Swiss-Prot record, chain A:
It holds the Pfam family Ribosomal_S11. Component of the ribosome, a large ribonucleoprotein complex responsible for the synthesis of proteins in the cell. The small ribosomal subunit (SSU) binds messenger RNAs (mRNAs) and translates the encoded message by selecting cognate aminoacyl-transfer RNA (tRNA) molecules. The large subunit (LSU) contains the ribosomal catalytic site termed the peptidyl transferase center (PTC), which catalyzes the formation of peptide bonds, thereby polymerizing the amino acids delivered by tRNAs into a polypeptide chain. Residues 109-125 are annotated as: Disordered. The lineage of its organism: Eukaryota, Fungi, Dikarya, Ascomycota, Saccharomycotina. GO terms for molecular function: mRNA binding; structural constituent of ribosome. GO terms for cellular component: 90S preribosome; cytosol; cytosolic small ribosomal subunit; nucleolus; nucleoplasm; small-subunit processome. Present with 29600 molecules/cell in log phase SD medium. Belongs to the universal ribosomal protein uS11 family. Keywords: Acetylation, Cytoplasm, Nucleus, Ribonucleoprotein, Ribosomal protein, Ribosome biogenesis, rRNA processing. Component of the small ribosomal subunit (SSU). Mature yeast ribosomes consist of a small (40S) and a large (60S) subunit. The 40S small subunit contains 1 molecule of ribosomal RNA (18S rRNA) and 33 different proteins (encoded by 57 genes). The large 60S subunit contains 3 rRNA molecules (25S, 5.8S and 5S rRNA) and 46 different proteins (encoded by 81 genes). uS11 interacts with eS1 forming part of the mRNA exit tunnel. uS11 interacts with snoRNA U3. uS11 interacts with MPP10. Component of the ribosomal small subunit (SSU) processome composed of at least 40 protein subunits and snoRNA U3. This is Small ribosomal subunit protein uS11A. It comes from Saccharomyces cerevisiae (strain ATCC 204508 / S288c). The gene is RPS14A.
UniProtKB/Swiss-Prot annotation, chain B:
Component of the small ribosomal subunit (SSU). Mature yeast ribosomes consist of a small (40S) and a large (60S) subunit. The 40S small subunit contains 1 molecule of ribosomal RNA (18S rRNA) and 33 different proteins (encoded by 57 genes). The large 60S subunit contains 3 rRNA molecules (25S, 5.8S and 5S rRNA) and 46 different proteins (encoded by 81 genes). One of its GO terms (molecular function) is mRNA binding. GO terms for biological process: cytoplasmic translation; maturation of SSU-rRNA; regulation of translational fidelity; ribosomal small subunit assembly; ribosomal subunit export from nucleus; translation. It is found in: Cytoplasm. Belongs to the universal ribosomal protein uS7 family. The gene is RPS5. Coiled coil: none annotated. There is a cross-link at K128 (Glycyl lysine isopeptide (Lys-Gly) (interchain with G-Cter in ubiquitin)). Component of the ribosome, a large ribonucleoprotein complex responsible for the synthesis of proteins in the cell. The small ribosomal subunit (SSU) binds messenger RNAs (mRNAs) and translates the encoded message by selecting cognate aminoacyl-transfer RNA (tRNA) molecules. The large subunit (LSU) contains the ribosomal catalytic site termed the peptidyl transferase center (PTC), which catalyzes the formation of peptide bonds, thereby polymerizing the amino acids delivered by tRNAs into a polypeptide chain. The keyword Cell membrane does not apply. The chain holds residues 76 to 225 of 225 of the full protein. This is Small ribosomal subunit protein uS7. Keywords: Acetylation, Cytoplasm, Isopeptide bond, Phosphoprotein, Ribonucleoprotein, Ribosomal protein, Ubl conjugation. N-terminally acetylated by acetyltransferase NatA. GO terms for cellular component: 90S preribosome; cytoplasm; cytosol; cytosolic small ribosomal subunit; ribosome.
Length: 125, 150
RNA sequence: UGAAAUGCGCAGAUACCGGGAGGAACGCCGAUGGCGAAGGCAGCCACCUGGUCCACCCGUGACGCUGAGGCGCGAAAGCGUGGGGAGCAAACCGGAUUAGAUACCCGGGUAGUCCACGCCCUAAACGAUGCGCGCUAGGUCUCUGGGUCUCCUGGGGGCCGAAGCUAACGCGUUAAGCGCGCCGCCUGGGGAGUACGGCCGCAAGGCUGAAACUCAAAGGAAUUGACGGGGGCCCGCACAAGCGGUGGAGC
């Protein structure tokens, strides 16, 4: 709509799925993608690093119309994929962006953590 | 690989090495004679049906038949992806010649006491003057496979 | 998860954003580092407090060393009362694997793990090496103080090594060397850290600690060898490349 060119990209990995949303210098999201956004179904789409890759690109390409060029990447959460590929899951997204055409100014890990909300199950703790 | 490339004596009729190679492809059981005859007779077939000189027709055929890119399997972290790759110039000829003879054998037409017509027809069909026939198909198919998995 | 299943989810889970509550731990810095007598101790802040090194050589003037029994401290688990409880998780309840699976793997889960007060007192509580002092080549890296600060000097942590020691492995100014002082401890293996007695403990248990009988060994280090999905280098029609074939039919 209204060219921005410089902005932020938030990569939110999880064991389930990857969702990336690009934003303005301000923080208001330009566009967003995920594995679901692309037509890929729940298990594979969601997590698969491949998916993360596709989602990353879709996010950038869509943002390209917005006139996006440079972006700061923020990584939140850890997650990946089951896939045979190395599938860090998060990394692929970080990669797809660097390649997508946008110049990535920086990668930053700001995974949130609770002070200590509630007990995790899932064999955690 | 199998061994160092041995140089081949050029063809008695037209002293072209490539021709001998083709002849070798045709021959089996070391019946070198029958093999040479089939190729020669085909060349005669190329002369009548087609105004062009056989030697030119054949070479053009091989060109159409040589695959530029082929896909080779490789094991990546997951699954074996088929990596596309160039083909050696040496490799391309062996594939082209081999594919011609195979496709030629493929043809229904059983002409001449032997195979000789199938070779004659196959080569013309190959030419890109006529770039059709079973030989070209394989060639086109491989290239298509490659760059599919670019 | 090897594959799975149990399990959770349409009373809407998972993934995503915001808000809140609660418990526990304290990423990077972080070390090959530091502190403490040991056990042990790592977010930041303040208060209270122990030990320790160096320089000056100023004060006392042998006031020293060790230390049976005592007293105190003493990881984890465990115990008592009360509190707390997010995650983790003996027992336990399920799923799977298996010949069986009272296990390893997966899903749950109570004590417990956290705090306070009291108790227990153990350990591969290890450097498997009691404390002090003196003496006996160096080299190298490191932490902390002084200096005339491309190195010297003091305290500490590592590595290599003189002399020497040691069964060997190894130790070697951080001694396992050369000496002196004092403490503790050993005396073949099993029976056995058991029995009995005593002392301690709420309890679990702890400390002390045998005998009969029995065996020619038990044992330490190192040597040759055999044995058991690390690395490097290199071969063979071993694979790949390629031509012909067996597996089908009849014989």
């Amino acid at each position: 709509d209204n060219s921005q060119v410089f902005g932020v990209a938030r990569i939110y990995a999880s064991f389930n799925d990857t969702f990336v949303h690009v934003t303005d210098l301000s923080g208001k999201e330009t566009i967003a993608r995920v594995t679901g956004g692309m037509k890929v179904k729940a298990d594979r789409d969601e997590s698969s690093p491949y998916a993360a890759m596709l989602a990353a690109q879709d996010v950038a390409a869509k943002c390209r119309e917005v006139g996006i060029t440079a972006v700061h990447v923020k990584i939140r959460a850890t997650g990946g994929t089951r896939t045979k590929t190395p599938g860090p899951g998060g990394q692929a997204a970080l990669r797809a962006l660097a390649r997508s055409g946008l110049r990535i100014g920086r990668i930053e890990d700001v995974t949130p953590v609770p002070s200590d909300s509630t007990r995790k199950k899932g064999g955690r703790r | 690989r199998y061994a160092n490339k041995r140089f081949r004596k050029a063809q008695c009729p037209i002293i072209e090495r490539l021709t001998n190679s083709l002849m070798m492809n045709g021959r089996n059981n070391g019946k070198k004679l029958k093999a040479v005859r089939i190729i020669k007779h085909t060349l005669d077939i190329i002369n009548v049906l087609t105004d062009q000189n056989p030697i030119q027709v054949v070479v053009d055929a091989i060109t159409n038949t040589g695959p530029r890119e082929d896909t080779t399997r490789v094991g990546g972290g997951g699954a074996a992806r088929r990596q596309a790759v160039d083909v050696s110039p040496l490799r391309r000829v062996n594939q082209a010649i081999a594919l011609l003879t195979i496709g030629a054998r493929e043809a229904a037409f059983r002409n001449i006491k032997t195979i000789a017509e199938t070779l004659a027809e196959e080569l013309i069909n190959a030419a890109k003057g006529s770039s059709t026939s079973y030989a070209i198909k394989k060639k086109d198919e491989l290239e298509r496979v490659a760059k599919s998995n670019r």
